[PDB]
Amino acid sequence: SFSGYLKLTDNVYIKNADIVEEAKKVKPTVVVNAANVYLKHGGGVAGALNKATNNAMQVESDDYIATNGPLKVGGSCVLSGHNLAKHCLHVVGPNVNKGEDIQLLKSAYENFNQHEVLLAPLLSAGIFGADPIHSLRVCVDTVRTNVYLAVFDKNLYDKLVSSF
Ligand SMILES: O=C(Nc1ccc(C(=O)NCc2c(C(=O)O)[nH]c3ccccc23)cc1)NC1CC1
């Protein structure tokens, strides 16, 4: 099971870890991907998860978009977790670097409530441009199911814990 996580609330836990390595070790029921609306997994968490699947995540994602069209910002879809998890919940948080509305971050975290337990990154953080301290606050105030947050950067992890 999940190990070495610091407890933040009744249901939110956090660890300084690479979500790829965490997923390979735990093989959770659900791993969250920090997706974009086109499911083009180029960089950040999405690029790293896709690379770990040997591009199988991108092949499945392209078939999903060809059938269904793009997701909405704040929306999600459930696909295979391949070699990382039973399922991957692809969630689209707003990308501040593309000018998207930061109020959609709460809608993005609401997708997590459809799953009892998840391994996840902070949405809209990293290359999506939002303040990770804000993202953690919205996560704690929105998600009611059990969420295990993996924060790649050690210095950001320490700041997130110390300012919580
Ligand atoms: O390449 C990797 N891992 C690996 C590579 C990159 C990341 C990463 O961009 N993280 C930042 C991030 C966070 C976060 O950390 O809060 N949230 C986000 C939301 C959207 C986009 C990005 C982020 C994460 C993991 N592993 C290989 C070597 C075995």
Side-chain angles (χ1 to χ4, degrees), residues 53-73:
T53 73
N54 183 43
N55 209 52
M57 179 182 284
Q58 188 65 66
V59 167
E60 178 195 31
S61 293
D62 288 347
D63 168 83
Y64 173 93
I65 295 289
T67 298
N68 297 292
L71 283 69
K72 294 170 178 179
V73 175

Side-chain angles (χ1 to χ4, degrees), residues 30-158:
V30 177
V31 65
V32 174
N33 179 35
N36 53 55
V37 297
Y38 304 107
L39 300 184
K40 285 301 191 212
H41 309 302
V45 167
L49 290 174
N50 177 60
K51 179 177 175 186
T53 73
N54 183 43
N55 209 52
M57 179 182 284
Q58 188 65 66
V59 167
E60 178 195 31
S61 293
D62 288 347
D63 168 83
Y64 173 93
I65 295 289
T67 298
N68 297 292
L71 283 69
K72 294 170 178 179
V73 175
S76 72
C77 70
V78 179
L79 292 176
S80 183
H82 302 277
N83 57 317
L84 303 174
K86 177 170 186 178
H87 300 298
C88 178
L89 179 70
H90 297 270
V91 181
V92 186
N95 186 324
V96 172
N97 297 324
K98 304 180 179 172
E100 295 167 351
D101 187 7
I102 194 59
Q103 297 176 114
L104 294 164
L105 186 54
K106 187 174 183 75
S107 298
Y109 274 116
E110 288 171 341
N111 296 283
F112 286 27
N113 290 321
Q114 301 292 318
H115 299 280
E116 290 195 349
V117 57
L118 313 92
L119 170 62
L122 284 171
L123 298 179
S124 296
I127 66 176
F128 278 59
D131 183 352
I133 292 177
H134 175 60
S135 184
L136 179 52
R137 172 39 49 195
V138 177
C139 178
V140 158
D141 291 345
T142 305
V143 180
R144 296 177 301 282
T145 54
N146 296 322
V147 58
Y148 290 83
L149 296 167
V151 173
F152 185 72
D153 194 277
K154 174 54 170 167
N155 292 321
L156 174 57
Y157 173 82
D158 287 347

